Predict the structure.
Amino acid sequence: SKDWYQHATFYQIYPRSFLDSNGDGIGDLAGITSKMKYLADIGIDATWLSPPFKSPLKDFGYDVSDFYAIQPEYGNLTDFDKLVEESHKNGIKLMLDFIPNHSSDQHEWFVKSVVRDPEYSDFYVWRPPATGGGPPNNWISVFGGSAWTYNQARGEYYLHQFTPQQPDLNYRNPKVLAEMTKMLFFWLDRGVDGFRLDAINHMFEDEQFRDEPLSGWGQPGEYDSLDHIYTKDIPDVYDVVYNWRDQMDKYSAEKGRTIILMTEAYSSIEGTMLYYESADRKRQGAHMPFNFQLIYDFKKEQNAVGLKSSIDWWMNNMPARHTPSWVAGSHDHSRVASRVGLDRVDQVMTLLHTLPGTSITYYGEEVAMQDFKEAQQFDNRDPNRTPMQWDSSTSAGFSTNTNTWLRVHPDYARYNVDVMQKNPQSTFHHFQHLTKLRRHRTMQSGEYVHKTVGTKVYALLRELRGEDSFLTVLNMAGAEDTVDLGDFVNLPQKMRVEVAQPNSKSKAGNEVDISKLTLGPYDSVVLRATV
Amino acid sequence: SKDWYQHATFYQIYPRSFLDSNGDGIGDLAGITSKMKYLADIGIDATWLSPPFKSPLKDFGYDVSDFYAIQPEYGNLTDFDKLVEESHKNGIKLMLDFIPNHSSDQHEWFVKSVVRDPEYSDFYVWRPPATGGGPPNNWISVFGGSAWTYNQARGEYYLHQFTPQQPDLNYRNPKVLAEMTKMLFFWLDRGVDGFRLDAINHMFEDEQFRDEPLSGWGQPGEYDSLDHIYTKDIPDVYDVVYNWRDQMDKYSAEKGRTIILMTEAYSSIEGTMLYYESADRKRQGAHMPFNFQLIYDFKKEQNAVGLKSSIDWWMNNMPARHTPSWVAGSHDHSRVASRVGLDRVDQVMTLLHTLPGTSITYYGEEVAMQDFKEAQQFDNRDPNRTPMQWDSSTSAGFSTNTNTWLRVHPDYARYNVDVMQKNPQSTFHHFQHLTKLRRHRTMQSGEYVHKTVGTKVYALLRELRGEDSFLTVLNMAGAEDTVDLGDFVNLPQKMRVEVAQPNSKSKAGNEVDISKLTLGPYDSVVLRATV
Ligand SMILES: [Ca+2]
Ligand SMILES: [Ca+2]
Ligand SMILES: [Mg+2]
Ligand SMILES: [Mg+2]
């Protein structure tokens, strides 16, 4: 289990929306705990837990009022401990979201910093008004408007790259780094198996607090109107990540399990790849920087050329001897079924789970959940955070309460675990076929050879000496075609259909002739051969 | 062999510059005939002969005044026959440049068409001046200025997409298509093995002769200032090429040798690929459209990401089950050594000859010839067309005459066949190593798997079940590095150095550990793994 992260099958749980175990309409930790067997049953061996920490919920958990406490409606620390134990019982690693860049403005540290408590005054970024009034500089929040908010009591502005309710922590202050590092080991000491480092490339800012220059586009006041050279990718962040990785490896050696780090950065491809490893290859950082290529580029009118080149954009730019990861949805993104269509969730899965490396599934993708736009109450991302759909009972089995924290999608009686489990030809069964296939050594450890077959068909061969070979084929067009896969020189003419998607011109267990493989609209198949 | 074109080792001969056999300073056909053994000796099995037809030389052979006759200084039709016979005796196919779009304005047809001879009047494109005067429409020659030239005798303009000395032939006239097809078979009957179709996508123009729209770039009067929707890629050409291919396939069956077509089009990638095959796969055209990717993109500051994505741009966009071809220079392009540097000619060769399919070598690449800019007398392409460099004698052995049609590059005593053959560490010996390696079944027929190894190293695996595997590795940086090739899952840790370029950190015949392969600046090696 030292190499578990190199071919993990990840599932992102959003704790407010997974399962409510006490009828208040809000998911909770005991609810998750009761479903860790379900996750293992569908082939998951690792979870990404979105932040369950105490939070005023201005950014639903990503604005943390206490980094050591559980949000009360989700449970307490003993509930968290029971979830860690039940995850490990079911063979599932638990990766906790870690929010380094900012705290809630209701955090004790910030309340005390506002009133100039000497213990915490410098925990945040405070600057006087500019000469002649106004913010200290022109920096703009990720969400628009000034990155600075005035506090009348202090007579100063504090920095927030995100909302004003998310004051940035001051990592130029070594006590800030030391405290957040200590908090990391607190959660490790409860059995956690790794961390996702949220918004990591927002950590440091220019020490001279200089104005950023204009981008050359966008209206004044818009985030995109400035070139963010003083507020993103400030390179001191890399040494912090590399140092944390070195502390995780040492902890891993002492405790006998492999602790991993993933980073979330929206950055240049070069700035992203430096989180894996320094340019000179002397330092290691994140095991797996988040890779959003499939969210960006698996689009409704993509062809196989664009799909392949999107995949190669990650792979070509990676450092050698590291692990790629792949993800199609998250708590920050519109659901796959709404983004690309119900008739395309199945081929997205087929691709997701057969690409080399680690696949990441957002809760509800396995029953083809859709955005419920009309449910939005608090946030533009509400539609992709509606309650998990478990059965056809009240509130889709998410809660006994008919009023849930966000409304359940109205079609839940057709798109839920119970109904789909009864249908051998459902997306749910397709998901399970694929995660079961991921256990095959060729999928875990084999080479990958991918090609187009004409510009509309994508094909991905996985091969490992001494093992059967597997060929994923996707039809990126909405019309039937019959194609010749003969450019894969080393495959036999006859192959077996290991997997065929719910609506497919193939059927699992049949043989096909790969010189004349018929693919239905948006088809996906995984073919098998003994070489 | 019916699939010779699928892994041909091509060599482009420029007849004026290859070998002068009679002391007038001009290359001739007898000179070429006497070097076909040299070509077979260095692993060439196919030649592209630049046009030797009668020509006033305003575009040095590409302005043809008699498509059935040889330019007198090059010899006559019996010399041509002797070259064909000696080519075949050495196992070399001869592909003849075919010039369909236009003739010289000294061709008898155009002379007669000017005076409105009814036999030839409609062989060219004649239109009255626009109402109020001026050319029929706004079309602009490829070489700048109007695509129309007035003739007072006719009181009309004739069309030339190239120089005014290259009037466009009128393929809307079936007699023109019949006559040019007749001429193809004339050369086929003399034993030629194929044709390169010059400037093929300029063949047809808008039948309404409508003005072309602006592109949005460039100054008025420049070629790049119009969107060439009426003068380039008019799709009627595809049917002409598909019909020619069908006629070549029939001729191939009757005569018992495989005739190929290659097409030269500067086009969109989509317009280029339609020369292979119709969109619906019902029609075949060129066996190999020219692929200039390596000329465009193997550049002084390229890295492995850019190099791989350039190769993938061709491969991704190809139709399935067709042959790729690769070329690094030509009679229209600055020579590799001047383009990228003398210290990079060797790694260009290594890549060129190990990519799947057919490689094309420009005469003189094998002795690292350089542009002689100061030799320019007639044409911007003169510097890359200087005489072939055979030995250290007068005029590099190209001629007994010190006055050659273009001056010989002044460094010829160091960069010539004779000197380099005596030096087993030379670019010439490296060339022969690679063309000998090309005859291995794995290179002719094996799969290809290519990757970056970090952003500066490109690696290309050729593998074929039951045969040894070969791994090409190129350092795109000008500094030494030691890299780990372990991402190629199925390769052994120990491999043999099959080829090492002249200045390399590896030596042929040594064993390397591919977890730590040291590469010198701009290195290139081919490693072998036994079965
Ligand atoms: Ca910050
Ligand atoms: Ca034309
Ligand atoms: Mg795994
Ligand atoms: Mg060959």
The longest strand of chain A covers residues 457-463. The first helix of chain A runs from residue 29 to 33.
